Write an enzyme that holds these catalytic residues in place. Structure first.
Site, mmCIF file in Angstrom:
data_model
loop_
_atom_site.group_PDB
_atom_site.id
_atom_site.type_symbol
_atom_site.label_atom_id
_atom_site.label_comp_id
_atom_site.label_asym_id
_atom_site.label_seq_id
_atom_site.Cartn_x
_atom_site.Cartn_y
_atom_site.Cartn_z
ATOM 1 C CG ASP A 68 35.293 -15.739 -12.084
ATOM 2 O OD1 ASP A 68 34.580 -14.842 -11.595
ATOM 3 O OD2 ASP A 68 35.298 -16.022 -13.302
ATOM 4 N N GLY A 126 35.116 -13.531 -26.638
ATOM 5 C CA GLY A 126 34.694 -12.702 -25.530
ATOM 6 C C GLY A 126 35.644 -11.549 -25.300
ATOM 7 C CG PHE A 170 38.644 -14.295 -23.121
ATOM 8 C CD1 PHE A 170 37.265 -14.395 -23.151
ATOM 9 C CD2 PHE A 170 39.392 -15.154 -23.916
ATOM 10 C CE1 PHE A 170 36.639 -15.338 -23.943
ATOM 11 C CE2 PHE A 170 38.772 -16.098 -24.715
ATOM 12 C CZ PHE A 170 37.395 -16.191 -24.728
ATOM 13 N N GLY A 171 39.304 -12.368 -25.306
ATOM 14 C CA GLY A 171 39.866 -12.663 -26.610
ATOM 15 C C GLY A 171 39.096 -13.757 -27.324
ATOM 16 N N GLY A 181 34.856 -19.838 -29.692
ATOM 17 C CA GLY A 181 34.193 -18.898 -28.815
ATOM 18 C C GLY A 181 34.965 -17.604 -28.759
HETATM 19 C C1 LIG Z 1 29.803 -21.162 -22.745
HETATM 20 C C2 LIG Z 1 31.280 -20.889 -23.003
HETATM 21 C C3 LIG Z 1 32.002 -22.105 -23.537
HETATM 22 O O1 LIG Z 1 31.379 -23.087 -23.907
HETATM 23 N N1 LIG Z 1 33.346 -22.050 -23.603
HETATM 24 C C4 LIG Z 1 34.152 -20.969 -23.026
HETATM 25 C C5 LIG Z 1 35.222 -20.466 -23.977
HETATM 26 C C6 LIG Z 1 34.764 -20.380 -25.428
HETATM 27 C C7 LIG Z 1 34.916 -21.661 -26.250
HETATM 28 C C8 LIG Z 1 34.067 -22.865 -25.828
HETATM 29 N N2 LIG Z 1 34.348 -24.120 -26.558
HETATM 30 C C9 LIG Z 1 35.516 -24.829 -26.479
HETATM 31 N N3 LIG Z 1 36.603 -24.420 -25.746
HETATM 32 C C10 LIG Z 1 37.630 -25.196 -25.268
HETATM 33 O O2 LIG Z 1 37.822 -26.347 -25.648
HETATM 34 C C11 LIG Z 1 38.517 -24.554 -24.248
HETATM 35 C C12 LIG Z 1 39.608 -25.215 -23.707
HETATM 36 C C13 LIG Z 1 40.378 -24.559 -22.772
HETATM 37 N N4 LIG Z 1 40.133 -23.309 -22.351
HETATM 38 C C14 LIG Z 1 39.072 -22.661 -22.873
HETATM 39 C C15 LIG Z 1 38.816 -21.270 -22.380
HETATM 40 C C16 LIG Z 1 38.249 -23.256 -23.820
HETATM 41 N N5 LIG Z 1 35.527 -25.948 -27.169
HETATM 42 C C17 LIG Z 1 34.265 -26.006 -27.763
HETATM 43 C C18 LIG Z 1 33.705 -27.023 -28.534
HETATM 44 C C19 LIG Z 1 32.384 -26.901 -28.935
HETATM 45 C C20 LIG Z 1 31.634 -25.789 -28.583
HETATM 46 C C21 LIG Z 1 32.177 -24.754 -27.822
HETATM 47 C C22 LIG Z 1 31.336 -23.548 -27.483
HETATM 48 C C23 LIG Z 1 33.510 -24.881 -27.417
HETATM 49 C C24 LIG Z 1 34.081 -23.082 -24.325
HETATM 50 C C25 LIG Z 1 28.959 -19.898 -22.773
HETATM 51 N N6 LIG Z 1 28.217 -19.707 -24.020
HETATM 52 C C26 LIG Z 1 29.091 -19.256 -25.100
HETATM 53 C C27 LIG Z 1 27.136 -18.746 -23.824
#
Ligand SMILES: */C(=C\C(=O)N1CCCC[C@@H](n2c(NC(=O)c3ccnc(C)c3)nc3cccc(C)c32)C1)CN(C)C
Length: 339
Positions: free
Chosen positions: A129, A12, A14-15, A10
């Site tokens: 938040d 955004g 933030f990075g 992902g």
């Molecule tokens: C939903 C946003 C969203 O699903 N995520 C927010 C950060 C982007 C990556 C995304 N994602 C993760 N992230 C993490 O495991 C993780 C762990 C700890 N801190 C953070 C910030 C993130 N792992 C993933 C696995 C599969 C799919 C995805 C998307 C994924 C989490 C909003 N939509 C993007 C619109």
């Protein structure tokens, strides 16, 4: 050096969040790479600091809060937060598969409640938040309902609370502005004083959205936001015009003390277009849950313990009562917050 970047998960402002291989520790991880800018680098260092305080106390991960693994500042200066690899946010699920059924919604409400009362009464921090974009599924695994053929989340539907950058404490700035506006409580908008109970306002707006697939307040303006609160929930309290804490907030009221009307044709249309939550939420226990999370009184508003212990969760997630986080399966807890 130690972390080899594998995937882009992902991206955004933030990075980036990337899947990485930990060469020394023999596993996959998610790495948050913050843009290498002074305001974000310092908000990452602050965000990091709230993250070590959650793990160091909850050493055996009893609550569905995020658990940092390691962190460092890159050789290019980017702040890098190493964490376990979780799944996508709840927002991603609702947009692809629609709203959750009562059971998984009850399971989500139970977990976030358990994490939030730990946040509120054990760490004495507010998240401020919470939004569907930072409530992540623990796993991105999928199951198929044999009767409906629609996608089912894991059983149980484990989630994780993320994004601790905006965490506050018991004497934050009193007129401070917190929350993304869609999930921002009225007490914050008008500077009436806010604390832990503003996290529970956000849960009301998230629970509505998880069940309907629609934002309750799709608004960009304070006064339109306030009229939507009036049309979705009922009249704003009469004393509110005398108690706002900033000039900006009090100018949204009459000299008498009533809300000033909008006449931007976009705000007149939207309020006419909103209908009360009480007619949209047909389930009476879910309705009572949402409405009393959106209570204008910050002390009659549900706290995290009451939310996770609500009759709605007990009806559709009955195995709630055999969970070690159920209130009556724990020792006597610190008192719930007053407002
Ligand atoms: C939903 C946003 C969203 O699903 N995520 C927010 C950060 C982007 C990556 C995304 N994602 C993760 N992230 C993490 O495991 C993780 C762990 C700890 N801190 C953070 C910030 C993130 N792992 C993933 C696995 C599969 C799919 C995805 C998307 C994924 C989490 C909003 N939509 C993007 C619109």
């Amino acid at each position: 050096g130690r972390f080899k970047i594998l995937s882009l998960l992902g991206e955004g402002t933030f990075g980036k969040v990337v899947e990485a291989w930990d060469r020394k520790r023999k596993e996959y991880c998610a790495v948050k790479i913050v843009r290498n800018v002074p305001k974000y680098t310092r908000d990452a260092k602050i965000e990091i600091q709230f993250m070590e305080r959650v793990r160091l106390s909850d050493v055996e991960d009893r609550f569905p809060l995020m658990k940092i693994q390691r962190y460092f500042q890159n050789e290019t200066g980017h702040m890098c937060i190493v964490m376990p690899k979780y799944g996508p946010c709840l927002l991603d699920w609702i947009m692809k598969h629609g709203p959750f059924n009562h059971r998984h919604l009850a399971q989500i409400i139970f977990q976030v409640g358990a994490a939030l009362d730990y946040f509120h009464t054990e760490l004495h921090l507010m998240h401020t938040d919470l939004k569907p974009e930072n409530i992540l599924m623990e796993s991105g695994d999928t199951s198929v309902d044999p009767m409906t053929h629609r996608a089912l989340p894991p059983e149980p539907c484990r989630v994780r609370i993320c994004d601790l950058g905006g965490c506050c404490d018991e004497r934050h700035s009193r007129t401070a502005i917190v929350s993304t506006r869609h999930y921002r409580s009225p007490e914050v908008v008008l500077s009436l004083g806010w604390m832990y109970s503003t996290d529970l306002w956000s849960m009301g707006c998230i629970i509505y959205e998880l069940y309907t697939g629609k934002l309750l307040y799709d608004t960009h303006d304070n006064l339109e936001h306030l009229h939507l609160m009036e049309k979705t929930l009922g009249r704003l309290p009469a004393d509110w015009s005398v108690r706002c804490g900033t000039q900006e907030a009090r100018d949204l009221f009459t000299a008498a003390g009533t809300l000033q009307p909008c006449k931007d044709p976009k705000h007149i249309a939207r309020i006419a277009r909103a209908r009360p939550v009480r007619e949209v939420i047909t389930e009476p226990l879910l309705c009572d849950l949402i409405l009393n999370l959106l209570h204008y009184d910050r002390q009659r508003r549900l706290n995290a313990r009451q939310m996770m212990s609500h009759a709605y969760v007990h009806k559709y997630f009955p195995e709630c009562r055999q969970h070690p986080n159920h209130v009556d399966n724990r020792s006597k807890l610190p008192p719930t917050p007053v407002m």
